[PDB]
Design an enzyme around this catalytic site. Structure first.
Site, mmCIF file in Angstrom:
data_model
loop_
_atom_site.group_PDB
_atom_site.id
_atom_site.type_symbol
_atom_site.label_atom_id
_atom_site.label_comp_id
_atom_site.label_asym_id
_atom_site.label_seq_id
_atom_site.Cartn_x
_atom_site.Cartn_y
_atom_site.Cartn_z
ATOM 1 N N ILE A 1 -3.405 12.997 22.380
ATOM 2 C CA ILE A 1 -3.818 13.500 21.376
ATOM 3 C C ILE A 1 -2.810 13.284 20.401
ATOM 4 O O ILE A 1 -1.831 14.228 20.582
ATOM 5 C CB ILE A 1 -4.720 14.496 21.135
ATOM 6 C CG1 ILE A 1 -6.068 14.290 22.225
ATOM 7 C CG2 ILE A 1 -5.193 15.091 19.773
ATOM 8 C CD1 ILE A 1 -6.858 13.255 21.750
ATOM 9 N N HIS B 1 -15.224 27.390 16.659
ATOM 10 C CA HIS B 1 -15.743 27.950 15.244
ATOM 11 C C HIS B 1 -14.829 27.429 13.883
ATOM 12 O O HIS B 1 -13.663 27.267 14.081
ATOM 13 C CB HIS B 1 -16.019 29.164 15.064
ATOM 14 C CG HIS B 1 -14.736 30.204 15.135
ATOM 15 N ND1 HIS B 1 -14.389 30.753 14.091
ATOM 16 C CD2 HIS B 1 -13.819 30.634 16.400
ATOM 17 C CE1 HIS B 1 -13.003 31.591 14.164
ATOM 18 N NE2 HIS B 1 -12.746 31.450 15.565
ATOM 19 N N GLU C 1 -18.786 32.676 13.321
ATOM 20 C CA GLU C 1 -18.247 33.343 14.513
ATOM 21 C C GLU C 1 -18.012 34.484 14.174
ATOM 22 O O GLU C 1 -17.895 35.418 14.905
ATOM 23 C CB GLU C 1 -17.114 32.146 15.139
ATOM 24 C CG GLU C 1 -16.748 33.012 16.492
ATOM 25 C CD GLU C 1 -15.771 33.895 16.362
ATOM 26 O OE1 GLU C 1 -15.155 34.264 15.462
ATOM 27 O OE2 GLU C 1 -15.583 34.525 17.610
ATOM 28 N N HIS D 1 -6.021 37.053 11.768
ATOM 29 C CA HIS D 1 -6.981 37.621 10.828
ATOM 30 C C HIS D 1 -6.144 38.043 9.585
ATOM 31 O O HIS D 1 -6.735 38.689 8.928
ATOM 32 C CB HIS D 1 -7.770 38.892 11.403
ATOM 33 C CG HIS D 1 -8.904 38.331 12.379
ATOM 34 N ND1 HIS D 1 -10.043 39.106 12.872
ATOM 35 C CD2 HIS D 1 -9.244 36.999 12.912
ATOM 36 C CE1 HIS D 1 -10.653 38.682 13.607
ATOM 37 N NE2 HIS D 1 -10.383 37.112 13.692
ATOM 38 N N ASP E 1 -0.127 20.992 20.604
ATOM 39 C CA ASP E 1 -0.082 19.543 21.040
ATOM 40 C C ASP E 1 -0.616 19.640 22.582
ATOM 41 O O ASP E 1 -1.455 18.730 22.820
ATOM 42 C CB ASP E 1 1.325 19.047 20.947
ATOM 43 C CG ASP E 1 1.499 17.777 21.415
ATOM 44 O OD1 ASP E 1 0.559 16.791 21.295
ATOM 45 O OD2 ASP E 1 2.834 17.093 21.705
HETATM 46 N N1 LIG Z 1 -12.470 36.639 18.965
HETATM 47 C C1 LIG Z 1 -11.918 35.356 18.440
HETATM 48 C C2 LIG Z 1 -10.528 35.344 19.182
HETATM 49 C C3 LIG Z 1 -10.469 34.869 20.530
HETATM 50 C C4 LIG Z 1 -11.099 33.556 21.282
HETATM 51 C C5 LIG Z 1 -10.849 33.670 22.573
HETATM 52 C C6 LIG Z 1 -10.730 34.675 23.526
HETATM 53 C C7 LIG Z 1 -10.290 35.808 22.800
HETATM 54 C C8 LIG Z 1 -10.139 36.098 21.466
HETATM 55 C C9 LIG Z 1 -11.756 35.195 17.071
HETATM 56 O O1 LIG Z 1 -11.323 36.299 16.502
HETATM 57 O O2 LIG Z 1 -12.063 34.340 16.159
HETATM 58 CA CA LIG Z 2 -0.184 14.676 22.251
HETATM 59 ZN ZN LIG Z 3 -11.397 32.655 16.777
HETATM 60 ZN ZN LIG Z 4 -11.059 35.596 14.502
#
Ligand SMILES: N[C@H](Cc1ccccc1)C(=O)O
Ligand SMILES: [Ca+2]
Ligand SMILES: [Zn+2]
Ligand SMILES: [Zn+2]
Ligand SMILES: N[C@H](Cc1ccccc1)C(=O)O
Length: 274
Positions: free
Chosen positions: A4, A85, A131, A244, A259
């Site tokens: 990719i 998401h 999400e 966040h 990557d």
């Molecule tokens: N809970 C996800 C982050 C996450 C993804 C996968 C495993 C653990 C945490 C978010 O804040 O969008």
């Molecule tokens: Ca690559």
């Molecule tokens: Zn997330």
């Molecule tokens: Zn998140």
């Protein structure tokens, strides 16, 4: 599988960044930056030959969307799904959370078209809405997928935060065949991985018996000394110091992690769809 191109994944992130800037600074559910994100991804998929569907739902008094992209062909009774998401929290552009997975999954879908790949299993990609409200889009999709169609799913692969600035290399410890395929890719790079323990959109699939797996590079938890020794970066700092946050911008990406995890996504999608 193809390799990719990192530059193409980074170019999708740039587009998402600019969409956030153009829409109040975020790509959150019920705000215009989210639908504009959907429109960008959908346009690329449509151009590549996917059959796309906009699945609408209402949450919190606002219209949300999932974007579903089916690659025509393959066994209708053995479907491999991969998703990410596409919403952010409202504090910022959500470039690592989760532009990174959204961009990796999009570029893998485009790579399928570029390669003329005809998997034995039918391929379906998804970009989930809301999400950050509690898996609302992926719950909506699973809740509205008839039992006959759920039984056709061979797997769901999730990519949520895969470009963390101080990364770890975590692989979900769920379905054993999916997990092994991801770990094999990293083995070939001589990059160690650890089991993910630090929810996300694989949960509604997992919870109804669909095999799942995925990749994650860490969020608000602190990298340990031992993890910095095996992967580099900084012990005692969060894997993602802008989790966040308003600073979850184009600067919040480790290109090597992005990557490798994009290449691993494609490796697993090819292997598991054969
Ligand atoms: N809970 C996800 C982050 C996450 C993804 C996968 C495993 C653990 C945490 C978010 O804040 O969008
Ligand atoms: Ca690559
Ligand atoms: Zn997330
Ligand atoms: Zn998140
Ligand atoms: N993308 C960062 C480098 C970088 C950070 C911040 C801004 C621009 C570039 C990396 O892979 O190390």
């Amino acid at each position: 599988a193809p390799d990719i191109p990192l530059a193409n994944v980074k170019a999708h992130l740039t587009q998402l960044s600019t969409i956030a800037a153009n829409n109040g600074g975020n790509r959150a559910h019920g705000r215009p930056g989210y639908k504009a994100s959907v429109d960008y991804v959908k346009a690329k998929l449509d151009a590549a030959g996917y059959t796309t569907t906009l699945q609408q739902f209402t949450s919190g008094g606002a219209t949300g969307y999932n974007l579903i992209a089916n690659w025509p062909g393959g066994d209708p009774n053995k479907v491999l799904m991969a998703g990410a998401h596409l919403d952010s929290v409202s504090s910022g552009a959500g470039i690592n959370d989760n532009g990174s997975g959204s961009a990796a999954v999009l570029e893998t879908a485009l790579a399928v078209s570029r390669a003329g790949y005809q998997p034995d299993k039918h391929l379906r990609f998804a970009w989930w809405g809301a999400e950050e409200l509690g898996l609302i889009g992926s719950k909506f999709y699973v809740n509205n997928l008839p039992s006959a169609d759920r039984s056709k799913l061979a797997g769901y692969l999730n990519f949520d935060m895969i470009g963390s600035p101080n990364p770890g290399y975590f692989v979900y410890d769920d379905d054993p065949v999916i997990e092994k395929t991801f770990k094999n890719y990293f083995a070939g790079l001589n990059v160690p991985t650890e089991i993910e323990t630090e929810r996300s959109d694989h949960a509604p699939f997992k919870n109804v018996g669909v095999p799942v797996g995925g990749l994650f590079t860490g969020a608000g938890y602190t990298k340990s000394a031992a993890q910095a020794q095996k992967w580099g970066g900084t012990a005692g700092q969060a894997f993602d110091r802008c989790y966040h946050s308003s600073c979850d911008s184009l600067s919040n990406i480790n290109d090597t992690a992005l990557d490798r995890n994009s290449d691993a996504a494609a490796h697993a999608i090819w292997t598991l769809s054969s």
